Amino acid sequence: KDVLECNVKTTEVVGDIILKPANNSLKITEEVGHTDLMAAYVDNSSLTIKKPNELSRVLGLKTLATHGLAAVNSVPWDTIANYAKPFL
């Protein structure tokens, strides 16, 4: 199984990969929401969503549960920017 060093608190199996606890590592979004997308737009950052919901699917986003290590900071900037502008 593939391994991801991230900010999880317990060792967890998500899909076909494993999240291992590492302090001050990669931030993990459990399920994407409005605040997560608003913060990624402001922080000049991407997102690593761990489990999918309706919003992540309709935005065509990759999650750790469905895409493994490929979801690491995989949320494109055009998606974050286009979602967040009706709210500014």
From Swiss-Prot:
- Put simply, this protein is called Papain-like protease nsp3
Give residue ranges for domain G2M: 1-88
Q: Where in the cell is it found?
A: Host endoplasmic reticulum membrane
The subunit structure is: May form homohexamers. Interacts with N protein.
Which species expresses this protein natively? Severe acute respiratory syndrome coronavirus 2 (2019-nCoV)
Activity regulation remarks: Inhibited in vitro by GRL-0617.
Q: Which function does this protein serve?
A: Responsible for the cleavages located at the N-terminus of the replicase polyprotein. Participates together with nsp4 in the assembly of virally-induced cytoplasmic double-membrane vesicles necessary for viral replication. Antagonizes innate immune induction of type I interferon by blocking the phosphorylation, dimerization and subsequent nuclear translocation of host IRF3. Also prevents host NF-kappa-B signaling. In addition, PL-PRO possesses a deubiquitinating/deISGylating activity and processes both 'Lys-48'- and 'Lys-63'-linked polyubiquitin chains from cellular substrates.
- Catalytic activity annotated for this protein? Thiol-dependent hydrolysis of ester, thioester, amide, peptide and isopeptide bonds formed by the C-terminal Gly of ubiquitin (a 76-residue protein attached to proteins as an intracellular targeting signal)
Q: Which domain of life is it from?
A: Viruses
Q: Indicate the span of the full protein covered.
A: 2059 to 2146 of 7096
Q: How does it sit in the membrane?
A: Multi-pass membrane protein
